[PDB]
Design an enzyme around this catalytic site. Structure first.
Site, PDB file in Angstrom:
ATOM      1  N   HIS A 191       7.983  11.528  -3.227  1.00  0.00           N
ATOM      2  CA  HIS A 191       7.923  10.258  -2.497  1.00  0.00           C
ATOM      3  C   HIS A 191       7.421   9.123  -3.401  1.00  0.00           C
ATOM      4  O   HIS A 191       7.628   7.947  -3.109  1.00  0.00           O
ATOM      5  CB  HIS A 191       7.050  10.351  -1.234  1.00  0.00           C
ATOM      6  CG  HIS A 191       7.826  10.636   0.026  1.00  0.00           C
ATOM      7  ND1 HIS A 191       7.254  11.230   1.138  1.00  0.00           N
ATOM      8  CD2 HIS A 191       9.116  10.375   0.361  1.00  0.00           C
ATOM      9  CE1 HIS A 191       8.172  11.356   2.082  1.00  0.00           C
ATOM     10  NE2 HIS A 191       9.305  10.845   1.635  1.00  0.00           N
TER      11      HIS A 191
ATOM     12  N   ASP B 180       8.382  18.069  -1.336  1.00  0.00           N
ATOM     13  CA  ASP B 180       8.004  16.741  -1.852  1.00  0.00           C
ATOM     14  C   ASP B 180       7.371  16.891  -3.215  1.00  0.00           C
ATOM     15  O   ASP B 180       6.191  16.540  -3.419  1.00  0.00           O
ATOM     16  CB  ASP B 180       7.037  16.046  -0.870  1.00  0.00           C
ATOM     17  CG  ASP B 180       6.654  14.624  -1.298  1.00  0.00           C
ATOM     18  OD1 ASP B 180       7.475  13.950  -1.974  1.00  0.00           O
ATOM     19  OD2 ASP B 180       5.534  14.174  -0.925  1.00  0.00           O
TER      20      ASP B 180
ATOM     21  N   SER C 117      -1.854  10.399  -3.612  1.00  0.00           N
ATOM     22  CA  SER C 117      -0.541  11.068  -3.598  1.00  0.00           C
ATOM     23  C   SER C 117       0.029  11.548  -4.930  1.00  0.00           C
ATOM     24  O   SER C 117      -0.198  10.982  -5.983  1.00  0.00           O
ATOM     25  CB  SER C 117       0.497  10.378  -2.728  1.00  0.00           C
ATOM     26  OG  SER C 117       0.473   9.005  -2.930  1.00  0.00           O
ATOM     27  N   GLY C 118       0.690  12.689  -4.851  1.00  0.00           N
ATOM     28  CA  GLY C 118       1.220  13.304  -6.027  1.00  0.00           C
ATOM     29  C   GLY C 118       0.100  14.039  -6.691  1.00  0.00           C
ATOM     30  O   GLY C 118       0.341  14.811  -7.597  1.00  0.00           O
TER      31      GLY C 118
END
Length: 228
Positions: A41, A89, A183-184
Site C-alpha cells: 500500500h 500487502d 506502515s510497511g
C-alpha cells in the site's frame, strides 16, 4: 506517536525508511543484503518515483556516519495485492547495490516456517510517523513492545469482524489515546521478523483496538522466489 518510545540509535540495524522524493513514506525491513520488505500500500498509487531506501538511520534529518540512501532497481508488490483490501500487502524493494553492512546495517532473519506467533508473545514494532506528524515527523526512530493477540478475538465483531485471515496476525494496539503504524514497518519476535504493518489500526477507536500485521511466514514461498 502516541504509542511508545525513542529507540536506541542503531540497535535495530535492519530498520529501513522507505522514501518518496526524499520524504519518509513507510517503514521497511532489510531481509537480504540487497532487498527490503515493506507493504504494497505504501508505494501504491501511480506516478513515480524516486522511491529510495534509507538504511543505517536513527534520525531522518540529522547527520549520521552510517546513513546511506539507496535507489531502488525494482519494486515488487505482491501480485495479489489490491488497493481495496489488506490482503497480500507486501512489497519487496531491490536496492541499487548490496547494502554495506556493519553495526548499523544488517539484515534480520525472517520466519520461513508457517506457524503462528503464540498469543501473548511480546514483539517489537519500530517506525517514524505519517502525513507530516510534525514536519520532521517524529524525527528519530521509535519502537514499542506489543503482546500478540489471538486471531479469534482479533476477529470479534467489534475488533476486526472476520477480516483477519490466517495469513494475518494481530497485536493489542494501545489504550490511553491513539495510534501509530508507520506502515510497511516490522514486527519482530525474539529477533525474528514475523510481521509487517498493514493499516491496522487506521480506523482507531475502542480500548482493545488491535494492530494488523501481515505474517511473513505465510508469504515465505513468494518472498524467497523473488529473491532467487
Amino acid at each position: 506517536i502516541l504509542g511508545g518510545r525513542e529507540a536506541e540509535a542503531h540497535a535495530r540495524p535492519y530498520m529501513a525508511s522507505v522514501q518518496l522524493n526524499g520524504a519518509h513514506l513507510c517503514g521497511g525491513v532489510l531481509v537480504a543484503e540487497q532487498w527490503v520488505l515493506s507493504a504494497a500500500h505504501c508505494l501504491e498509487d501511480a506516478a513515480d518515483g524516486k522511491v529510495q531506501v534509507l538504511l543505517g538511520a536513527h534520525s531522518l534529518s540529522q547527520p549520521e556516519p552510517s546513513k546511506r540512501l539507496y535507489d531502488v532497481l525494482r519494486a515488487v508488490p505482491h501480485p495479489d495485492s489490491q488497493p481495496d483490501t489488506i490482503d497480500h500487502d507486501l512489497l519487496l524493494l531491490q536496492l541499487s547495490e548490496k547494502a554495506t553492512l556493519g553495526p548499523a546495517v544488517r539484515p534480520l532473519p525472517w520466519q520461513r516456517v508457517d506457524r503462528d506467533v503464540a498469543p501473548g508473545t511480546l514483539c517489537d514494532v519500530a517506525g517514524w510517523g505519517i502525513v507530516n506528524h510534525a514536519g520532521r515527523r517524529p524525527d528519530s526512530l521509535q519502537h514499542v513492545l506489543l503482546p500478540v493477540l489471538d486471531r479469534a478475538t482479533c476477529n470479534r465483531r467489534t475488533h476486526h469482524d472476520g477480516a483477519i485471515t490466517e495469513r494475518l496476525m494481530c497485536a493489542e494496539s494501545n489504550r490511553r489515546d491513539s495510534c501509530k503504524g508507520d506502515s510497511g514497518g516490522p514486527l519482530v519476535c525474539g529477533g525474528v521478523l514475523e510481521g509487517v504493518v498493514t493499516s491496522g489500526s487506521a480506523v482507531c477507536g475502542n480500548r482493545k483496538k488491535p494492530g494488523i500485521y501481515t505474517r511473513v511466514a505465510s508469504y515465505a514461498a513468494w518472498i524467497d522466489s523473488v529473491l532467487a
